[PDB]
Amino acid sequence: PEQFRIRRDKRARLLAQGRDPYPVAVPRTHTLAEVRAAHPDLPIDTATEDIVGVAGRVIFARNSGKLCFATLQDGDGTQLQVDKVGQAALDAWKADVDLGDIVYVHGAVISSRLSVLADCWRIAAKSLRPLPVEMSEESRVRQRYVDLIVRPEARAVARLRIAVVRAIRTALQRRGFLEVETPVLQTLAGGAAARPFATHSNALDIDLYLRIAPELFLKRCIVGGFDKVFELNRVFRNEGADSTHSPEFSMLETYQTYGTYDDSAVVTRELIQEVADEAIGTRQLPLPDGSVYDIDGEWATIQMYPSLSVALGEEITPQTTVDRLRGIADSLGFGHGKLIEELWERTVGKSLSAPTFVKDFPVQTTPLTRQHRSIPGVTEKWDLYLRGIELATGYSELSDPVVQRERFADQARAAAAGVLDEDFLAALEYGMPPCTGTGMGIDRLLMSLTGLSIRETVLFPI
Template sequence: MASDANRPSDSSGSSRDEIRAIRLQKVEDLKQLGLNPYAYRWEITHHAAELQEKYTDIVAGQEVETEVSLAGRILARRVFGKLAFFTLQDETGLIQLYLDKKEIASGMAETDADAFEHLKSLTDVGDIIGVKGIIKRTEKGELSVKVREYALLTKSLLPLPDKWHGLTDVAKRYRQRYVDLIVNPEVRDTFRKRALITASIRRYLDQQGFIEIETPVLQTEAGGADARPFITYHNTLDMQLYLRIATELHLKRLIVGGFEKVFEMGRIFRNEGISTKHNPEFTSIEVYQAYADYSDMMDLTETIIATAAKDVLGTLQITYQGETIDLTPPWRRITMHEAVQEKTGVDFSQFTVLEEAKAAAKAAGLTGVDDCDSIGRLLNEGFEQAVEETLIQPTFIIDYPVEISPLAKPHRSKPGLVERFEMFIVGRETANSFSELTDPIDQRQRLELQAAKKAAGDLEAHSVDEDFLTALEYGMPPTGGLGIGIDRLVMLLTDCASIRDAIAFPLLKPEKMDTAADQAAP
């Protein structure tokens, strides 16, 4: 039998505006019939995935007389005279609706004598409906809800993409995430897993005696990282403020105040570039533990990430972009000097003269070395160029140059280095940790160096935070600090190639700005 067309039709040749006009007319038609196209509520007893699991064993042609009630969006509709089949999607998945004119006429005789005809002519793909009925497996083997009653809950005015199972325009997916979520179930799965990952981390830290305390987003001094801040202004107080670039300095104040285990998971804002690895606002967790050092934080990092993977994925053997990753602790630990020497053949620890180190770096093929003003920065340049992208399996790079670590404690046995690690996996930094600097005099000197760089035009350097230094002078116990990039961790555990796939609403230029830029391009 041929399918009946909608009257009037959402034909594939119609423009978006034409389809919207047709659907607006249907809204008016519904109102004229005394039917509300935008309902107030619907009582739900079951969800699609629950029904698919519960009734997996019933055979073709079998019906189960238990009434079910569910609601969701129409993703497909096929109408054949007195019989129709809709595909309904709710938050958990898909189920077929079996719509028989006789059954619906019987179930809805008192509320809408022409309910089946209205279903045929006034509903569209994209509409949200509620249904009540019984479970039936069709002769073709499709588990279905045999509908006895239905109600249009929300009339959709705009069409879904032509192929509802695939919205492929990447920019449009990010810009209209709500459509992306409707038509790409794997995207919903990513954000569901993201919620489970963050819940797992919080639950584990809670079990270990850590407490979460919120710190200010608006700050009078940007600090805790080398990053360019966003600047804003408070009218009543007549003062310039910064969106935080880290939660570090306020969480450390809490350690000074007597808390021994604190953390915060929240948004961080950095006025920097955008790439597959960077978004100007992102989520991180920072954890501080009194009487601990960076070795303790390595153990904590392994456990947090392995626990989240086990809780959410059920395994420590994961696949990322085709690469098998083993998250089983313990992970490899190697110093930055050793890692750079492995890849370049240069042992930067043997140099005391910067020019000699630069010559060796150039001979090893490193670029941009003339801009490095110390051997420590040269070492870091060698790491970023030769090592970072090769670290596929989880690896702790430990013992960093003091020049690039202004908040870390000097290494207890290696002059010129600090007790710091970064954890790399699939070529990306995912965690950062210090044995925290607790000497207020040393800390002042390092912050003053940062302030001098800011005065010289370094947009990522910051002023001296006098209140933080005052806090340190009251005394902070030995402390281990840890930061983990939640977005990058979600990317890893959900196999997302881009950070934009792990953030529900990534920052994008408005479409008009993109269009103007395209037109201006040569």
């Protein structure tokens, strides 16, 4: 609290002295990593004539006499510690240097009874705030910058999420997918059931809506002649937060002409497995529960109605009235579809461990997905539940316009108190070849793979 001020003192009396604590440039030559990787086994307490210039953060100090010792930590986490040139050197070192301070050092590299000793040295930046040694998982998230410095785990994760996301891109691109960019500000926001964030434009004297999802535009792409498209990026759903939900988040969507939810469920499996392999290296996923979640080999596929039927010891179908459902609903603790999914989730959903697609969903609650090819009353959507998390949905995509138009009229009357995406429908009545969309949640993906909270999967939330 106090030593805040002391650090400011130390800054001032380096300006007026004309030494620079925020130098433009400082001729670093190697990363601590690069040093390590060059010099694995050096005979301890022998020397080598590799001059280098390295920068780092002083995190351990042990100042004593003619000689000070200190740990330098590259930002990536790597570590290298530190007669030679000048006593004034030592006095500045002793008097000027605190911890959390960024420091360049020149010199040759040696083994300690692996450090370096100084031709030159200089401050690259003066911290006017000492690093704390514990911090609340909440304070942590509010100051990720410190987290990242002091807490290793923050580092690896941040890097992982990145590694994963590269993995995804690598994979889709290997399969001949083209990443596209579609609007975020939209005249009306479609592609999912969520309340949008609305904002005012000065330029058009109108409101605008942050995209809850890209599907409608991504579809317009397929129309326009895209074989295979994805768009990995952020969506905004104006609603509550919870372990699995957060109002802005990063989402994959995917679309493949000439293929069905059967095929896309396959891709989605391989996709996820490739990711694990690229970014983690095992399909036997370690967890803070000491446990290991296996995701290798093949994954089960069950139907919603069937699997639910077995669960309630009773046949349930598209046919089953609301009253029956409602009643069964009560026996345990709006409309048909909503009840089926509720019941399904509430019974079969919860119970699952290993990786499982469910498929064949109540039409009532899947207006964008095609009617099932043989079975009446249902659509060709899957969900994919992975270690007990709804991670992804695939669809055989509703290409028919008039069906689709109807699909909305019903949805629309649903919340009336007395406007459709006419352009989207225009799009469809130009032709849209058969295709299967997926959607996947990137935090849930990591969460599902790791057991980390949604608050740890991303750099900066609130």
